[PDB]
């Protein structure tokens, strides 16, 4: 729904992300909001502005909420649910946080509660990574950018599973995989995964069939989660479900 820019007042500069601009701000001078600013040729706008549509639908406490757009100027505006602690990647690079294990694994069942709710709607991410997770003010972790690598006019080696790097073969199982990198990039507090190798070098050895060391701050428990993602196999790969049974399991 076309939200009015009359209504909407830019308070602070929140930097660069997907897209461009992002800026803090209020509606009516009553809520909190983030306003995306699309760059221009960035995006396929007329195919995002329709899925924009079935976005709004979409609703989870732990999902980064879509209050609508400004389609009606140069350039089109995304309001969002403002996030205060930014990034989860920069959050969990701030060594100053001295986060707890408890902490992390609350981080992983965050996420994973807002990809069981996108999984039972039968809604792909197809990017889920800590760059495109966002902290609120209270420290809680929730999924943004969910399917959004579908308009992008550098690409996710990294997160990708090996029958996406050889073939291109995405599903439920790639968000899956992902996921699993995720929760290692958590533990690992925010360490590149592969660093020593580049994109097509850290491509080669996931097709062999190279998998993500243990972090030390995961516990055998935990690694057993994560390693549950990484199966060669896709269908050997948990569910969203039975990944948030498991972390509920290990939060005892
Ligand atoms: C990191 N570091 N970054 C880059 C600077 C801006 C920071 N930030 N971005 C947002 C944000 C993220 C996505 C938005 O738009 C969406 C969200 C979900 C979706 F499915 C589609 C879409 F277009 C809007 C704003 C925020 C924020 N929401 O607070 C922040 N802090 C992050």
């Not at 060594?95 to 069942?109: I, P, S, Y």
């Not at 959004?148 to 073939?167: A, D, G, I, Q, T």
Request: glycine residues 6%.
């Amino acid at each position: 729904w076309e939200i009015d820019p009359k209504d909407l007042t830019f308070l602070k500069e929140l930097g660069t992300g997907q897209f461009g601009v992002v800026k803090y701000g209020k509606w009516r001078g009553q809520y909190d909001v983030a306003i995306k600013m699309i760059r221009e040729g960035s995006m396929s706008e007329d195919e995002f502005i329709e899925e924009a549509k079935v976005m709004m639908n979409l609703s989870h406490e732990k999902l980064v909420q879509l209050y609508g757009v400004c389609t009606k100027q140069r350039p089109i505006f995304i309001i969002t649910e403002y996030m205060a602690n930014g990034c989860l990647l920069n959050y969990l690079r701030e060594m100053r946080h001295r986060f707890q294990t408890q902490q992390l694994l609350e981080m992983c069942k965050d996420v994973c509660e807002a990809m069981e709710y996108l999984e039972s709607k039968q809604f792909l991410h197809r990017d889920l990574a800590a760059r495109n997770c966002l902290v609120n003010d209270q420290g809680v972790v929730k999924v943004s950018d969910f399917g959004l690598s579908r308009y992008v006019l550098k690409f996710p080696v990294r997160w990708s599973p090996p029958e996406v790097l050889m073939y291109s073969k995405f599903s439920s199982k790639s968000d899956i995989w992902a996921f699993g990198v995720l929760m290692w990039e958590i533990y690992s507090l925010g360490k590149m995964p592969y660093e020593r190798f580049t994109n097509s070098e850290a491509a080669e050895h996931i097709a062999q069939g190279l998998r993500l060391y243990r972090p030390h701050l995961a516990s055998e428990r935990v690694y057993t989660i994560m390693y549950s993602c990484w199966h060669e196999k896709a269908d050997e790969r948990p569910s969203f479900k039975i990944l948030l049974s498991n972390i509920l399991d290990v939060m005892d």
